[PDB]
């Protein structure tokens, strides 16, 4: 319980009061002072190690909140605790050698209710430099490639937010000589 607030993953309340606005992006609270404090929730910010840092609210719209109380969960957190994973009904037994030498067998029931579903964000990048034959630019206009291949690229060459790309698909354009 101490970890999340000491890790500053989950955002808490600075004073007793009522939550006027509850949203996934932000949580605004009205305190006893009458002051309106907005808490912009960090939503799926890429970690240095890849895992998504998200913050999900836990307080109903327009409800009482005390000082030092949870407003929204942090990454790997449930109800203001540290939830690095999900506790699952584990049976400790050999199974046809599938659990062999620390190997772990798993029910597809866990995949059913999306237990152990890690959101990972990879950071890709393209940097341009100027050469005498021709510099480099981030554009949608990419030679010898179908529009169907550029289906998920906007005008700027950036992959459209919300698209599903696969290995081989284009993320950012860049052309030189």
């Amino acid at each position: 319980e101490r970890v999340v607030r000491d890790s500053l993953a989950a955002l808490y309340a600075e004073e007793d009061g009522e939550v006027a606005k509850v949203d996934g992006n932000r949580i605004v609270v009205r305190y006893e002072d009458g002051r309106l404090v907005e808490y912009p929730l960090r939503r799926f910010y890429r970690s240095n190690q890849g895992t998504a840092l998200d913050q999900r609210p836990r307080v109903v719209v327009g409800q009482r909140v005390r000082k030092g109380d949870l407003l929204a969960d942090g990454p790997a957190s449930e109800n203001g605790f540290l939830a690095l994973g999900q506790n699952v009904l584990v049976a400790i037994m050999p199974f046809d050698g599938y659990n062999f030498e620390d190997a772990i067998v798993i029910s597809e029931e866990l995949l059913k209710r999306d237990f152990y579903t890690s959101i990972h964000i990879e950071r890709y990048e393209i940097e341009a430099r100027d050469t005498k034959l021709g510099p480099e630019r981030i554009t949608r206009d990419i030679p010898h490639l179908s529009e169907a291949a550029l289906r998920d690229l906007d005008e700027e060459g950036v992959v459209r937010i919300g698209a599903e790309v696969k290995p081989g698909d284009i993320l950012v354009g860049r052309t030189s000589f």
Partner: protein
């Protein structure tokens, strides 16, 4: 076991069989009623478990219960790395990326 006892369900023959194998194993106390046998057995953190593929009860009861297992940063898709060929480095004609 209370729901089973409340509905009107007796003990499973498979359960009594596991209690036989366990009595042979000496986990549970001998001679007591299957509900008490299963009581002491559950006290041991073990339950009568049936192999879903066989149906026959897994002879010798096994330990079950929620464990806070967590997924680790060392997942597969980041690590998987197979290749027929690969573009060779310019500084050295060994394949790199």
């Amino acid at each position: 076991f209370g729901k089973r006892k409340g509905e009107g369900f007796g003990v499973d023959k498979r359960e009594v069989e596991v209690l036989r194998r366990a009595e042979k194993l000496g986990l549970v106390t001998p001679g007591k009623t299957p509900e008490e046998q299963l009581k002491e057995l559950f006290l041991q953190g073990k339950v009568v478990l049936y192999d879903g593929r066989t149906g026959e009860p897994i002879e010798g009861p096994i330990v079950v219960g929620q464990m806070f297992i967590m997924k680790l940063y060392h997942m597969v898709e980041d690590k998987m790395h197979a290749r027929s060929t690969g573009p060779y480095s310019l500084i050295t004609q060994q394949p790199l990326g």
